[PDB]
Design an enzyme around this catalytic site. Structure first.
Site, mmCIF file in Angstrom:
data_model
loop_
_atom_site.group_PDB
_atom_site.id
_atom_site.type_symbol
_atom_site.label_atom_id
_atom_site.label_comp_id
_atom_site.label_asym_id
_atom_site.label_seq_id
_atom_site.Cartn_x
_atom_site.Cartn_y
_atom_site.Cartn_z
ATOM 1 C CB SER A 214 -1.026 -0.097 1.126
ATOM 2 O OG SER A 214 -2.078 0.816 0.896
ATOM 3 C CD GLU A 347 -5.040 -4.845 -4.088
ATOM 4 O OE1 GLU A 347 -5.310 -4.142 -3.093
ATOM 5 O OE2 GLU A 347 -3.951 -5.430 -4.257
ATOM 6 C CG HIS A 467 -5.429 -2.614 -0.142
ATOM 7 N ND1 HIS A 467 -4.411 -2.680 -1.068
ATOM 8 C CD2 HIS A 467 -5.114 -1.592 0.693
ATOM 9 C CE1 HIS A 467 -3.506 -1.754 -0.791
ATOM 10 N NE2 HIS A 467 -3.910 -1.079 0.271
#
Length: 566
Positions: A214, A347, A467
């Site tokens: 990230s 995600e 995610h």
């Protein structure tokens, strides 16, 4: 986050504290650093592996007083032995679960972990840079436990860096020496420390791998782009992000005044008086007000965060980002090191709770004009060409008569992750000489083993691989539990850490010694490839054409008449 999960989290915090006592041995050890000796402790894991743990190693002077908002300075050396048997504070931030400010300005530390301080051969060094949108995160082992990596003969290092306005304030006035990116400059200083000191812990300074997820992936990419770090490391892994993602940079030079006013500042908008006020403010007050900083206009223009990596307005000795990251790719030293990139298989599932709270967000899919890249959209987003581009986005993601929350989340996977990955691969091919890049897709779903970021986003019971769900298979955390050797989760831990260690060692992620990888032919992406291929990690390891490719090409088609901007 509900009160029910908040109570469950507090219970887990207490249980984890006593578990960590039971996992601490009475064996301590001293190691050398360029600034003085450090004492670490031997710890166990729930699997009865063991490792030496050094936490709270300073790599910079505490950025307090006159050093607030400034580039990091090298720490003061010490005689005697610094106790590194416990963690230090995290950077000042709003707790992602409790919602109150926590941490300290005294946060420029790193942690080093290895199963053997005097190994028979120098070891690959893996350096993890955490995500959290440049506003949250830590190297605490309740979130980032080294327990899985230390099964193997590597050195693992988890860094901290300044977050929020304290890490990313930027002022135009050259005389004030606050150009921006202090938190990225912290990462630079930590990487220099690692190069200079990892050998004291059994590490190989000629074989350093930086990885992050990230905002940690954007950070790792920034560390591959800046001249400040040229030659400091040897492989990079970008997990669900990179530095050309639209969320990964912002021009925030005018926002220091706005933050000061929110904090009680009575003066005018000039950098010197604004900085003087911000130098005296309590750090908790600045961090708690950050969520209010973006103006109505900036929210309208879909600015993601008020403070973050920025193109610095003037040059300094420590300058990290002298140009936009897209331009930095063109001359980046990191284009010439082995690189691995990837994403999870859903995600955007990250947005599940946001869509539950505000279901009207799905109306954005009626025309999709707000998802058109800003460089292609007119200012009002009403031009016929902008509506046409939006229509192409809509066709890619709206699969039924009426747009759904699932359509929205699928679009999010692309706008935030897959499309910037594609743009980076294509940009970088034009500025590299055959250095390989390898793609993975993490596609393993379990609800038997989870991590705190699923709780932070209120996603218990939500099926799909969102995610940050892969971090469960890289790092121990306080919600984890011991899994059976034969379980699908245990095998996934071995496979993920094993692939990352293999890539860190050799620059090639394939090894026939990883279970299920024997029949894998994992080639890197070539410039001539029209369809990307990746290793898909599910219950099996399989090379596949990237399933997202068709939608990626639909996004790319918006640039057909504007190829110079792609």
């Amino acid at each position: 986050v509900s009160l029910m999960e908040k109570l469950k989290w507090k219970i887990k915090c207490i249980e984890n504290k006593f578990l960590n006592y039971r996992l601490t041995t009475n064996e301590t050890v001293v190691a050398e650093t360029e600034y003085g000796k450090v004492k670490g402790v031997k710890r166990l894991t729930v699997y009865d592996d063991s490792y030496y743990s050094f936490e709270g190693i300073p790599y910079a002077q505490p950025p307090v007083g006159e050093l607030r908002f400034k580039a990091p300075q090298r720490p003061t050396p010490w005689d005697g032995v610094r106790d590194c048997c416990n963690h230090k504070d995290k950077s000042v931030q709003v707790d992602f679960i409790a919602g109150k400010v926590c941490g300290s300005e005294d946060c420029l530390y790193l942690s080093v972990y290895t199963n053997n301080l005097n190994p028979e051969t120098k070891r690959p060094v893996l350096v993890y840079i955490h995500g959290g949108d440049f506003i949250i995160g830590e190297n605490h082992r309740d979130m980032y436990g080294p327990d899985y990596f230390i099964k193997k003969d590597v050195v693992l290092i988890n860094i901290q860096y300044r977050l929020g306005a304290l890490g990313f304030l930027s002022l135009n006035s050259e005389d004030l020496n606050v150009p921006g990116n202090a938190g990225l400059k912290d990462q630079v200083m930590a990487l220099r420390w690692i190069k200079n000191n990892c050998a004291n812990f059994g590490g190989n300074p000629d074989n350093i791998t930086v990885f992050g997820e990230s905002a940690g992936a954007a950070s790792t990419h920034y560390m591959m782009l800046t001249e400040q770090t040229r030659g400091l490391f040897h492989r990079g892994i970008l997990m669900s992000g990179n530095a050309i993602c639209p969320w990964a940079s912002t021009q925030c030079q005018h926002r220091a005044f706005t933050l000061a006013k929110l904090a009680g500042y009575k003066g005018e908008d000039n950098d010197k008086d604004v900085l003087e006020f911000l130098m005296k403010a309590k750090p908790q007050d600045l961090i708690k007000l950050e969520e209010k900083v973006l103006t109505l206009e900036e929210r309208t223009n879909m600015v993601v965060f008020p403070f973050g990596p920025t193109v610095e307005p003037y040059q300094t000795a420590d300058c990290v980002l002298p140009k936009h990251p897209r331009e930095m790719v063109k001359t980046a030293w990191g284009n010439s090191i082995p690189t691995m990139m990837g994403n999870t298989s859903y995600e955007g599932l990250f947005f599940t709770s946001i869509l539950k709270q505000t279901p009207m967000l799905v109306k954005e899919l009626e025309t999709c004009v707000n998802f058109v890249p800003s460089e292609l959209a007119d200012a009002e987003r009403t031009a016929p060409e902008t509506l046409e581009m939006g229509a192409k986005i809509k066709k890619a993601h709206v699969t039924g008569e009426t747009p759904t929350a699932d359509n929205f989340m699928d679009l999010c996977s692309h706008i935030y992750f897959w499309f910037p990955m594609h743009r980076l691969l294509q940009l970088r091919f034009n500025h590299t000489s055959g250095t390989p890049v390898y793609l993975y897709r993490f596609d393993f779903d379990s609800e038997d083993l989870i991590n705190p970021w699923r709780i932070m986003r209120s996603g218990r019971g939500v099926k799909g691989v969102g995610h940050a769900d892969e971090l469960t298979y890289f790092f121990w955390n306080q919600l984890a539990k011991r899994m059976p050797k034969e379980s699908r989760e245990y095998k996934t831990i071995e496979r993920m850490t094993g692939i990352w260690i293999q890539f860190a060692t050799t620059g090639n992620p394939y090894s026939n010694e990883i279970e299920g990888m024997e029949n894998v032919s994992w080639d890197p992406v070539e410039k001539s490839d029209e369809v990307y291929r990746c290793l898909n990690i599910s219950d099996e390891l399989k090379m596949i054409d990237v399933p997202e490719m068709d939608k990626i090409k639909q996004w790319e088609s918006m640039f057909e008449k504007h190829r110079d901007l792609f």
